[PDB]
Amino acid sequence: VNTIIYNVGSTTISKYATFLNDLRNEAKDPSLKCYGIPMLPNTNTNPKYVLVELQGSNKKTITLMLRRNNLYVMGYSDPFETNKCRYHIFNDISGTERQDVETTLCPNANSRVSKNINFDSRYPTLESKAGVKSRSQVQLGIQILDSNIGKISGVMSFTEKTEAEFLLVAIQMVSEAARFKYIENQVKTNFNRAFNPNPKVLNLQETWGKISTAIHDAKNGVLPKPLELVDASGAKWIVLRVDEIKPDVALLNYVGGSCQTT
Ligand SMILES: Nc1nc2[nH]cnc2c(=O)[nH]1
Numbered sequence: 096v097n098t099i100i101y102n103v104g105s106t107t108i109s110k111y112a113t114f115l116n117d118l119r120n121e122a123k124d125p126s127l128k129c130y131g132i133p134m135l136p137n138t139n140t141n142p143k144y145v146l147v148e149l150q151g152s153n154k155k156t157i158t159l160m161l162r163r164n165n166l167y168v169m170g171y172s173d174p175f176e177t178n179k180c181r182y183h184i185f186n187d188i189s190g191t192e193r194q195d196v197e198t199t200l201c202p203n204a205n206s207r208v209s210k211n212i213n214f215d216s217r218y219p220t221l222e223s224k225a226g227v228k229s230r231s232q233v234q235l236g237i238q239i240l241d242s243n244i245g246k247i248s249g250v251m252s253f254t255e256k257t258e259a260e261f262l263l264v265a266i267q268m269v270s271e272a273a274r275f276k277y278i279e280n281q282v283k284t285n286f287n288r289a290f291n292p293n294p295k296v297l298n299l300q301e302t303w304g305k306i307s308t309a310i311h312d313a314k315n316g317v318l319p320k321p322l323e324l325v326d327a328s329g330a331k332w333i334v335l336r337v338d339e340i341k342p343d344v345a346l347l348n349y350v351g352g353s354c355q356t357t
Contacts (some may be wrong), residue, residue: 096142096199097121103241104152108283111237118273119345121145122163129311129354130337134347138164144199147269151244159265160200164349166270168216168262172200173248180207187215212258216266218300224259231297233263234289235282240264267292271300277343295332298325299343306340307348313337313355 099121101114119133122145127134140163147159159171169188175181180201184193201207214220222230243261247253272279278296299306302324312319316337324340326332334340 096144096146098146098148098158100148100150102150103237103244104150106237108286111283111286112279115273115279115345118145118147118269122161122166122273123346124349127349128356129347129350130313130316130341131357132310132341132344132347134307134311135165135349136163137349137351144169144195146199149240149244149265149269151241151248153245155245155248157244157248157261157265158200159269160196161270166274166346168266168270170196170200170212171265175208175249178206181210182207183210183212185212185214185216187217212262213255214259216262218263221259221263221266224255225263226256229297230263230267231292231294233260234291235264235267235285236289237268237282237286239289240268267296267300271296274303274346275299275343276345279345293327294325294329295327304348306344308350310337310340310344310347311350311352311354315355 099114099117122135123133124136124140127136143163145161145163147161149157149159157171157173160169161167162169169192170182170184172180172182180203182197182200184196188196197207197209214224218230225233227233243264246257247261267278268282272282277299281290281296306322309318309322318335318337322334322340324332324334
């Protein structure tokens with residue numbers, strides 16, 4: 096299990112871009128790809144996880160554990176107390192995976208403390224915890240991500256609202272940005288300011304699996320059936336070919352079976 100480090104406290108659009116590129120190259124399957132777009136690995140492939148160490152201002156760090164298969168965040172850890180490693184596992188993580196998050200995030204058995212996230216990783220759950228009707232009401236941004244790391248890291252106790260806000264920002268700026276070139280671009284274009292995700296970034300996040308299946312199944316660049324998406328203005332956007340959606344997509348969800356590689 097490799098760790099990718101990104102300093103949020105001091106970066107540039109180029110460093111952010113290199114970060115996402117390293118994560119994509121680390122997450123992706125060496126050989127899997129459809130129409131030039133790299134695809135995530137099978138649940139069987141090792142390693143199964145990838146760590147993302149986020150270095151914020153004021154020496155505040157938080158490490159995110161990501162499942163390579165779908166890039167979902169399983170949980171995160173932070174340096175706690177003196178030399179203790181505090182791991183936080185999502186409520187929706189179960190079975191052997193819970194032990195993997197615990198031992199992968201905090202590899203030192205003698206000095207690890209736990210603080211479970213008492214809710215699941217679904218956006219609607221995160222949005223209700225954060226106290227909003229939609230995550231579009233929560234601004235994303237480098238400085239915002241840095242600020243949230245400071246509210247969590249090393250902090251004895253924090254509200255579920257504060258933890259949810261952190262998750263909402265971290266997931267979209269890390270996982271969602273790695274999956275979609277479009278979302279990466281939105282971040283870079285608004286790099287020096289806070290911004291609200293437009294209808295297209297939220298739609299893209301919510302239909303990633305469908306897009307991945309559609310592209311994998313497309314024949315001669317034509318989607319099996321018309322894909323109804325939403326553009327940046329909030330208007331219906333009908334896609335018929337892979338060429339029309341490919342520019343906004345960096346990574347495909349794992350879809351079993353063969354597909355036209357290029
Ligand atoms: N852990 C996790 N929860 C999510 N909720 C919506 N998208 C995601 C994601 O990529 N990861």
